[PDB]
Design a protein around this ligand. Structure first.
Ligand code: NA
Length: 121
């Protein structure tokens, strides 16, 4: 149906917008602390701590399958990256501090992304 096609075009355009958002967030992580999953070979105890691991590569995989239906879903995954780091790592670490700085810088990006998603529909 044409109605199904139109829904598919909208998901495609959301995907484009979330790709640009993902790129902008990831630029705020030049150390690449959050680029890839935590390896269970190097933090064998990780999944005892963190129930839902998340990283930018994982998000990019989902995005490329058009797997985010709305901005809320994408934000949930970005918040997991930050929140998981803040739990596993102590306040005095480069990891915790990098998560705080990513959250703060990322707020800017997401604030305008929400206005654009709402405005374009
Ligand atoms: Na902690």
């Amino acid at each position: 149906s044409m109605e199904q096609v139109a829904m598919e075009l909208r998901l495609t355009e959301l995907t484009r917008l979330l790709r640009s958002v993902l790129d902008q967030l990831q630029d705020k992580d030049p150390a690449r602390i959050f680029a890839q999953p935590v390896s269970l070979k190097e933090v064998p105890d990780y999944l005892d701590h963190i129930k839902h691991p998340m990283d930018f590569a994982t998000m990019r995989k989902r995005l490329e399958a058009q797997g985010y239906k709305n901005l809320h879903e994408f934000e949930e995954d970005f918040d997991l990256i930050i929140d998981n780091c803040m739990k596993y790592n102590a306040r005095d670490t480069v990891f915790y501090r990098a998560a705080v700085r990513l959250r703060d810088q990322g707020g800017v990006v997401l604030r305008q992304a929400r206005r654009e998603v709402d405005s374009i529909g």
